[PDB]
Amino acid sequence: NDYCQHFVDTGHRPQNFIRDLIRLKDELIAKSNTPPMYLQADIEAFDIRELTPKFDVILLEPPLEEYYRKCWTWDDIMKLEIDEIAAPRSFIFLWCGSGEGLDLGRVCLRKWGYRRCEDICWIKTNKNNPLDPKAVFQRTKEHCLMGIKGTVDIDLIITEEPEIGNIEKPVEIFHIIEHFCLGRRRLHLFGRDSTIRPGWLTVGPTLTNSNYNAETYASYFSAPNSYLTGCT
Amino acid sequence: LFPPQWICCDIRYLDVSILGKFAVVMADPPWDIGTLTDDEMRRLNIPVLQDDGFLFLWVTGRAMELGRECLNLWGYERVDEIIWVKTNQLQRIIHWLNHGKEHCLVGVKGNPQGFNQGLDCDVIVAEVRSTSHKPDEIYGMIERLSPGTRKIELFGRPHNVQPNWITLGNQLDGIHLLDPDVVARFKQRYPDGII
């Protein structure tokens, strides 16, 4: 059965037709999860160095212009000082969309000094509702690239495409990130009120409330918790 | 000449100029991760094959970046990336993660025109037939985009022979050429007939 041909006919995307114990690691993640902390910041005009200590995971989710049919160009993004706040061995997940970010985002990663190890691809289904000039196909997926520095989950996330102008990323990304057990200092740049979450330090230009306190924060990782994988 | 044609050879030594110009180029190359070394990859004579047109380049692991290099080096801009979602006979999903997909870069050269941009969508779902195989569905997608036109595949295996397609592998069964202009430039470039 050919689904590329079917979509030509009906408008249902090939992905509209995919189908379908380890519950304890979720619980251990929860125990080791710090309080949620969330700091409002107009990140353009914000010195990243103020964000401390140095992070074990950085989830970066910049408002791409392409999300709307204040935006951040890749020109804008590629000039963040992400290396300054990463940790010697640490990770990064960068939402690139499907356009130039597929390429400019790899540049970024190399710039801040990461090398890619994973290409996690969000697949958007149009079950409940069957274009760049520079495009060739209907784009129906986004890429969240995963990079490392120093030193059971799959690389697919399938959900129904969100209502137009909804921009939130599928939360499963968090479950993929957290099931890796890469430490506890976690940072979600350009988060929003809506994404605040235990175990994470959200930082963004629309957060309507703030509780972040560099010192208060560091204390959660004061010895004897420095190198917790956060799954224990 | 509409039917398949193929050339068992070494794509590193064949005077690919004799093959002319193609609307679509596709390559499923054996990346060092048969093998070609990265320079051989860089050194391939892709730029002769197209004046205007599209290139489809399969990648895995770290070819994801090198392939973006070779793509750019040969003179294409990557415009789309295609994903293949690998399923079983009942439509379920067969380093740091387990991999449910393979990747295919799409590049563009010149000012190609007449194409049906937008006909299909950048995700593919089809059964994992055999190993190392790519799904016949890509020939669907590529036909609808530039129907009727000259297409050339590189590092094809004897199954990848297709109508309108000149396959180039080193497991192909000899040489089968029917297009005159090519059959021409071949005997002129190749008199005894070995590469």
Ligand SMILES: CC(C)[C@@H]1N(Cc2ccc(C(=O)NC[C@]3(O)CCCN(c4ncnc5[nH]ccc45)C3)c(O)c2)CC12CCC2
């Ligand atoms: C996502 C893609 C990267 C991935 N690919 C990986 C792959 C697997 C098998 C073959 C293959 O065996 N191809 C036939 C062959 O003939 C055999 C020998 C080498 N090769 C040559 N042909 C002409 N001259 C040559 N000189 C040196 C080599 C040579 C071609 C291949 O090419 C690529 C497959 C995918 C598709 C999804 C996964």
